[PDB]
């Protein structure tokens, strides 16, 4: 599980984008408040997740 701060995520940004798609594991971005908390997920993994949630 990869957990990084907003500042370190900003710095390592381009490597995080390929790791997320290669490892199929989201990057957790955690800071000192709720406006700084997010996850980065690969577009294709995210589309599969969108399929699982919007079935026929």
């Amino acid at each position: 599980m990869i957990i990084t701060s907003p500042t370190e995520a900003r710095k390592d940004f381009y490597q995080l984008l390929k790791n997320v798609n290669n490892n199929h594991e989201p990057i957790y971005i955690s800071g000192n408040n709720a406006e700084n908390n997010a996850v980065i997920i690969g577009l294709e993994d995210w589309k599969s997740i969108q399929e699982t949630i919007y079935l026929e």
Binding site: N23, H24, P26, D45, S48, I49, T52
Partner: protein, 87 residues
């Protein structure tokens, strides 16, 4: 440096779900890593518990895994599951 990758024939029904869900490309990228180094720390490779049974997993995506064991003696990877949704 090179391994034989096989799959239990009772697990081949998973491959049809992998195909119909457009995950065949991600699955065979795992197969290529299993052919070369099944312990490479990529694709969220994890040692499953209990670790004395030496089962491993790799992510096809966020939902589905390839579960497998490795015969280090004969250099052979046995895929036991390629679908992680209850069906």
């Amino acid at each position: 440096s090179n391994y034989t990758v096989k799959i239990k024939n009772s697990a081949k029904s998973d491959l049809k779900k992998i195909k119909h869900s457009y995950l065949k490309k991600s699955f065979l990228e795992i197969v290529e890593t299993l052919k070369n180094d099944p312990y490479k720390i990529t694709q969220s490779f994890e040692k499953l518990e209990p670790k004395y049974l030496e089962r491993y997993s790799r992510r096809i995506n966020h939902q589905h895994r390839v579960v497998y064991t490795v015969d280090d003696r004969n250099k052979e990877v046995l895929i036991l599951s390629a679908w992680s949704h209850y069906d």
